[PDB]
Amino acid sequence: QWSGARALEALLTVAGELRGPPLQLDTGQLLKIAKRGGVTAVEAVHAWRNALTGAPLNLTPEQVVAIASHDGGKQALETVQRLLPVLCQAHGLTPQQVVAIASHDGGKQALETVQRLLPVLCQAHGLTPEQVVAIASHDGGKQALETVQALLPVLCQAHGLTPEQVVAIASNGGGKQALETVQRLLPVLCQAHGLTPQQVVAIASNGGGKQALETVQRLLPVLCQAHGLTPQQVVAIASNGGGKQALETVQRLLPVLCQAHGLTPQQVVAIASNKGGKQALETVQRLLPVLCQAHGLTPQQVVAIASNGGGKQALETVQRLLPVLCQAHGLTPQQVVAIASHDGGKQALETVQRLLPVLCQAHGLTPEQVVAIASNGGGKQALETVQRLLPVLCQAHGLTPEQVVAIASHDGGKQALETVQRLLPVLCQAHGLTPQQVVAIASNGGGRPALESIVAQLSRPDPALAALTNDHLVALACLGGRPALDAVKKLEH
DNA sequence: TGTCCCTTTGTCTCTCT
DNA sequence: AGAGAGATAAAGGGACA
Numbered sequence: 001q002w003s004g005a006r007a008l009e010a011l012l013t014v015a016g017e018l019r020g021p022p023l024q025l026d027t028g029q030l031l032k033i034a035k036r037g038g039v040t041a042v043e044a045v046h047a048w049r050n051a052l053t054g055a056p057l058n059l060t061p062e063q064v065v066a067i068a069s070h071d072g073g074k075q076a077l078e079t080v081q082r083l084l085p086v087l088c089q090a091h092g093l094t095p096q097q098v099v100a101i102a103s104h105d106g107g108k109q110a111l112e113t114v115q116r117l118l119p120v121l122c123q124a125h126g127l128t129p130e131q132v133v134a135i136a137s138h139d140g141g142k143q144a145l146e147t148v149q150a151l152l153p154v155l156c157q158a159h160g161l162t163p164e165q166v167v168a169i170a171s172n173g174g175g176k177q178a179l180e181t182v183q184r185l186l187p188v189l190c191q192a193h194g195l196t197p198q199q200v201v202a203i204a205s206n207g208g209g210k211q212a213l214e215t216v217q218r219l220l221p222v223l224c225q226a227h228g229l230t231p232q233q234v235v236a237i238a239s240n241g242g243g244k245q246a247l248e249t250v251q252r253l254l255p256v257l258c259q260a261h262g263l264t265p266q267q268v269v270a271i272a273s274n275k276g277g278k279q280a281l282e283t284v285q286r287l288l289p290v291l292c293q294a295h296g297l298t299p300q301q302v303v304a305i306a307s308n309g310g311g312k313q314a315l316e317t318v319q320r321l322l323p324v325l326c327q328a329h330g331l332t333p334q335q336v337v338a339i340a341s342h343d344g345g346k347q348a349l350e351t352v353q354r355l356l357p358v359l360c361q362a363h364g365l366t367p368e369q370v371v372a373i374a375s376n377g378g379g380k381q382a383l384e385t386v387q388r389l390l391p392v393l394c395q396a397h398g399l400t401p402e403q404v405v406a407i408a409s410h411d412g413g414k415q416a417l418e419t420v421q422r423l424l425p426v427l428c429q430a431h432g433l434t435p436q437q438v439v440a441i442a443s444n445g446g447g448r449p450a451l452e453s454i455v456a457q458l459s460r461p462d463p464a465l466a467a468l469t470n471d472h473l474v475a476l477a478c479l480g481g482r483p484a485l486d487a488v489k490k491l492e493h
Numbered sequence: 494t495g496t497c498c499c500t501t502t503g504t505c506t507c508t509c510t
Numbered sequence: 511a512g513a514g515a516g517a518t519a520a521a522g523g524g525a526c527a
Contacts, residue, residue: 007494032520035520035521036520036521038494038495039494040494040495040496071495071496071497071498072495072496072497073496074495074496075495075496075497100518103518103519105496105497105498105499106496106497106498108496108497109496109497109498134517137517137518139497139498139499140497140498140499141498142497142498143497143498143499168516171516171517172516173498173499173500174498174499174500175499176498176499177498177499177500202514202515205515205516206516207499207500207501207502208499208500208501209500210499210500211499211500211501236514239514239515240514240515241501241502241503242501242502243500243501244500244501245500245501245502274502274503275501275502275503275504276501276502276503277502278501278502279501279502279503309502309503309504309505310502310503310504312502312503313502313503313504343503343504343505343506344503344504344505346503346504347503347504347505377504377505377506378504378505378506379505380504380505381504381505381506411505411506411507412505412506412507413506414505414506415505415506415507445506445507445508445511446506446507446508447507448506448507449506449507480508480509480510481507481508482507482508483507483508483509
């Protein structure tokens with residue numbers, strides 16, 4: 001008999017139980033824990049279900065699931081019930097910060113290292129607890145924290161990095177490797193190739209930071225001679241998430257894409273310059289002719305779709321959905337391209353296919369409005385949030401559908417919609433902003449934190465901003481969101 | 494296997510002008 | 511507004527006890 005059977009059965013017995021109180025998990029959550037934390041994590045969740053749920057710790061099931069669903073999840077759960085009160089009461093962290101540190105493979109190691117090293121990192125090395133938490137909150141967090149403790153001086157003094165730069169490099173999975181590689185390659189990349197430390201930090205500050213730095217060292221000469229690529233272009237390919245894989249793929253596919261399809265090197269660099277850039281390039285090589293036949297999509301339109309994170313996913317999804325969306329839903333090919341040409345284009349496209357009928361029919365939006373909401377990063381999230389929140393926003397808060405669509409139609413649309421739902425009443429009733437002013441603040445990228453900054457100034461006024469009327473603060477918030485408010489405070493004093 | 498650490502890819506959100 | 515940057519996450523491999 002297949003040896004995995006007894007454990008699978010154990011897994012399923014314990015799982016079915018967790019569907020009960022006090023966690024009541026769903027198949028999705030159960031699968032998630034089983035898939036990364038394994039049977040051991042599922043059993044640990046059950047055994048610890050009562051101790052995590054309410055007082056003392058009072059963790060939500062989502063938080064329990066977030067902690068359990070990683071390699072060593074059982075170890076992280078044990079450690080969180082032990083160290084959460086310590087970290088909150090002895091170092092002044094929030095439960096949310098503790099849970100963030102915990103929710104990665106080896107979370108136990110991260111938690112224990114934060115407990116051990118936070119004081120020396122803050123006192124002796126000058127970091128804030130926020131910076132320590134960010135460093136800790138990735139797989140290998142323990143290694144990154146220990147490497148920051150060891151290398152912070154040499155990186156700032158011998159190599160000229162700011163502590164902020166060191167923190168940014170550390171704050172990725174594989175942070176220890178990136179830090180060590182920067183220490184070794186910074187003078188090589190700067191002195192031999194004329195890169196600024198800023199460009200080096202930009203290359204290093206991503207997962208696979210080590211790999212991207214070594215690949216830039218190895219490939220920069222070859223790429224900047226034989227392929228007429230500029231150093232700026234190579235840095236961009238390396239620093240945008242594509243890392244080592246994107247660089248090696250550009251070396252392979254630049255001449256193929258240029259010669260065979262007439263793409264420009266600028267176009268190839270743009271396709272390369274994202275997470276999964278390698279995947280995007282190879283998919284363009286494969287799919288451009290299939291999409292561009294019959295005067296179908298133009299090359300330019302294909303390049304636009306490809307030129308985002310997950311470009312490969314967007315491309316393949318366009319190929320799948322272009323005909324059904326255009327025919328069955330009446331969208332233009334142009335509109336499909338629009339929807340597809342953002343990070344997560346696949347998700348947005350699939351969500352439009354699914355929700356365009358319902359938003360139009362059940363909520364009285366136009367297809368144009370659905371497309372407008374869909375055509376931003378996180379479009380899927382904004383579409384599903386419009387579906388959920390249109391009746392409460394309109395019926396209870398008095399907003400028009402047009403205003404809801406406008407809030408929804410930016411990156412972070414979901415966040416802006418939820419925040420308006422949350423804060424409209426205190427902003428309007430308690431502080432006399434008009435709904436129109438609230439909608440104006442929220443109808444930009446960064447809508448949510450702009451609203452929260454405003455609410456904060458009205459609820460605990462900082463004298464630094466007290467010379468501005470609500471109307472002026474509203475104008476400021478619309479102009480430049482939370483950062484503009486923060487910037488103005490700095491100006492005051 | 495369980496746990497830890499690293500790398501790649503994909504998705505979402507905010508900033509910066 | 512559209513590029514750049516960072517946050518959050520899934521999932522696979524190396525390593526080792």
